Amino acid sequence: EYPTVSEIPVGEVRLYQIADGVWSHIATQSFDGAVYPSNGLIVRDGDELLLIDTAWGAKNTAALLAEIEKQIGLPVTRAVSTHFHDDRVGGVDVLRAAGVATYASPSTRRLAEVEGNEIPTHSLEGLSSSGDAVRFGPVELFYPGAAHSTDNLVVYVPSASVLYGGCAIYELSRTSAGNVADADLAEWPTSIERIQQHYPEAQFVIPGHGLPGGLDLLKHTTNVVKAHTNR
Ligand SMILES: O=C(N[C@H](c1ccccc1O)P(=O)(O)O)c1csc2ccccc12
Numbered sequence: 735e736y737p738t739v740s741e742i743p744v745g746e747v748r749l750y751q752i753a754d755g756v757w758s759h760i761a762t763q764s765f766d767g768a769v770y771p772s773n774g775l776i777v778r779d780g781d782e783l784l785l786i787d788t789a790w791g792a793k794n795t796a797a798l799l800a801e802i803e804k805q806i807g808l809p810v811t812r813a814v815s816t817h818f819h820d821d822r823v824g825g826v827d828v829l830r831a832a833g834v835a836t837y838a839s840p841s842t843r844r845l846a847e848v849e850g851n852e853i854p855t856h857s858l859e860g861l862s863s864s865g866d867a868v869r870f871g872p873v874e875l876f877y878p879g880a881a882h883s884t885d886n887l888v889v890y891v892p893s894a895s896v897l898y899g900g901c902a903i904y905e906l907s908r909t910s911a912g913n914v915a916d917a918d919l920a921e922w923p924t925s926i927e928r929i930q931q932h933y934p935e936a937q938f939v940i941p942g943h944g945l946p947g948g949l950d951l952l953k954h955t956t957n958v959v960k961a962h963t964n965r
Pocket residue numbers: 765770771772819820821822901908911912913942943944
């Protein structure tokens with residue numbers, strides 16, 4: 735049902751309708767001779783769309799916009815990047831060029847700048863302390879605390895009970911931590927517990943990469959992170 739990394743030619747983007755007015759977007763990026771899948775979110779807000787995260791790169795992000803115009807045909811007026819790494823902000827210049835207002839927390843914008851990555855135009859206030867939540871159009875943005883990165887945000891669509899955890903949440907088939915250079919391994923399980931406490935009603939949980947699931951993805955991620963902690 736859900737597109738897997740094998741079924742998407744590099745450069746092409748798939749959309750997957752999660753619930754009413756909620757899609758994920760799936761793209762792949764070759765990297766070090768391996769191919770990785772990557773997820774973002776699209777949320778309908780009246781007759782406009784809110785975009786969550788780029789499709790990992792200029793060419794992928796351009797194809798994302800073209801696929802949205804093709805299948806949904808509503809304008810992407812705003813976009814939020816959930817942390818500063820290239821798979822979340824790579825392509826922000828393309829969004830900006832297309833007239834999309836791009837947003838991130840000031841923590842994310844700063845870290846993107848230090849990394850030399852593309853930098854969202856707008857700063858999201860009210861997200862600087864663990865447990866902070868703000869509404870942003872049809873979603874709630876939540877800062878659970880440092881985890882995959884110190885700045886990661888998670889996104890919840892209350893109308894559809896969809897939780898988008900970004901790269902702070904692992905898919906079930908990932909049993910080892912992979913890249914954690916910018917992570918807070920010490921705070922990560924506590925941050926995940928805050929997600930569980932704040933969204934106990936979530937019906938669908940979308941990880942930053944790979945297959946969606948339920949709230950079981952959270953304790954699975956904690957297990958992976960604690961195992962890596964004890965490596
Ligand atoms: O895509 C993965 N890493 C993301 C990433 C990698 C390189 C540069 C920027 C960037 O953003 P990330 O660290 O930001 O999540 C990833 C690492 S192992 C694995 C296994 C399955 C699917 C994906 C991955």
